[PDB]
């Protein structure tokens, strides 16, 4: 169950994240993600961080870096992306092939953008997708709260694209 | 602008659909789709109907059949699917390759399931995607109304996966 399996952690970067826009319940999401990280380390299973880069999240800048609270090691894998989709024009599919990964446990931000897209893509490419409950977050968007957006998308993913894990 | 381009019409089937389970503003959607179908025939451009099948929408059954109101012809293309993603284990990608299609104008039901998935897939496979405004529909879901769901998904898609036609 923990073989040919990677933890895929999407766009957990400081600058997602402005003073006026706080990600919904982020502290608890990062705590839950760090718990998964720790299980992957114990099993020596691959952990892959995806980092987005664009004009307002410039590559290598302080704002592009991963939240400090996340447990990273030089041993982890890092993918650079420029679209919501973590496979779109990236080295993601190649790395998964090189690592013999068929199963992806996915977490990150934002729920309805990069996370949703990468889940639909990964399922569509033939990967087996998994998710730990409460490991995505997003922002109130002026029409729906973060809570409503999260409820909506997680209900779409359950069963049709991925399985939610038990603790 | 009309070369290497197909109209991709998702899941316009009688059984979608039922008393109590009514698609938001469906007649107006099917009217606008028939307008686009007319444009495509004029330019001799491919029109592709996707039809979903499952135990509750059995393949070839009356419920699985396309809404009668749609203007189909024997000459159009038809794709069978089993999952929200119209590319997943289907011959969509092969047909597009065979027909030399790079641009897809996408319509159908339901917004947040098959249409959203097929859009994100088509974009991520490198197709250029387009959409006529008001050509998706879906159901109230117990948390969100059909209109809220449509507003939500269409706003994600705009600029990011596809361009709405002007």
- Helix-and-strand structural type of chain A: alpha/beta
- Report how far apart the termini of chain A are: 14 Å
For the record, the CATH class of chain A is Alpha Beta
By CATH, the superfamily of chain A comes out as: Isochorismatase-like
Q: At CATH's second level, what is the architecture of chain A?
A: 3-Layer(aba) Sandwich
Strand content of chain A: 15-25%
What name is given to the CATH topology of chain A? Rossmann fold
Along the chain, the helix and strand elements of chain A come as: EHEEHEHEEHE
- DSSP helix count of chain A? 4
Largest interface pair: A-B, 22 and 22 residues
Based on CA atoms alone, the radius of gyration of chain A comes out at 15 Å
Number of domains of chain A: 1
The quaternary structure here is homodimer
Shape of chain A: globular
Largest sheet composition of chain A: 7 strands, parallel
Total strands of chain A: the figure is: 7
Instruction: Estimate percent helicity of chain A.
Output: 25-40%
Family (chain B): Belongs to the isochorismatase family.
GO molecular function (chain B): hydrolase activity
Domain Isochorismatase-like (chain B): 6-143
Keywords (chain B): Hydrolase
Concise description?
Helix content of chain A is 31%, strand content 20%.
Structural overview:
The structure is a homodimer. The first copy, chain A, is α/β, with parallel strands linked by helices and 167 residues long. Chain A has a single domain (1-167), classed as Rossmann fold. The first copy, chain A, has helices spanning 26-42, 92-98, 111-125, 146-157; strands at residues 5-10, 47-52, 77-81, 103-109, 128-131, 136-137, 162-164. In chain A, strands 1, 2, 3, 4, 5, 6 and 7 form a seven-stranded parallel sheet that branches. In chain A, strand 1 (5-10), helix 1 (26-42) and strand 2 (47-52) form a beta-alpha-beta unit. Chain A: Keywords: Hydrolase.
């Amino acid at each position: 169950a923990m073989k040919n399996r990677a933890l895929l952690l999407i766009d957990f970067q400081k600058g997602i994240e402005s003073p006026t826009q706080q990600l919904y319940r982020l502290p608890a999401v990062l705590d839950k993600v760090n718990q998964r990280i720790a299980v992957y380390r114990q099993h020596h299973a691959p952990i892959i961080f995806v980092q987005h880069e664009e004009t307002e999240l410039p590559f290598g800048s302080d704002s592009w870096q991963l939240f400090e609270k996340l447990d990273t090691q030089p041993t982890d894998f890092f993918i650079r992306k420029t679209h919501a989709n973590a496979f779109y024009q990236t080295n993601l599919n190649d790395l998964l092939t090189e690592q013999a990964v068929q199963t992806l446990e996915i977490a990150g931000v934002q729920t309805e953008f990069c996370v949703d897209t990468t889940i639909r893509m990964a399922h569509g490419l033939g990967y087996t997708c998994l998710m730990t409950p409460k490991t995505t977050s997003t922002l109130d968007n002026g029409h729906l709260t973060a809570a409503q957006i999260i409820q909506h998308h997680e209900a779409i993913w359950a069963g049709r694209f991925l399985t939610f894990l038990s603790l």
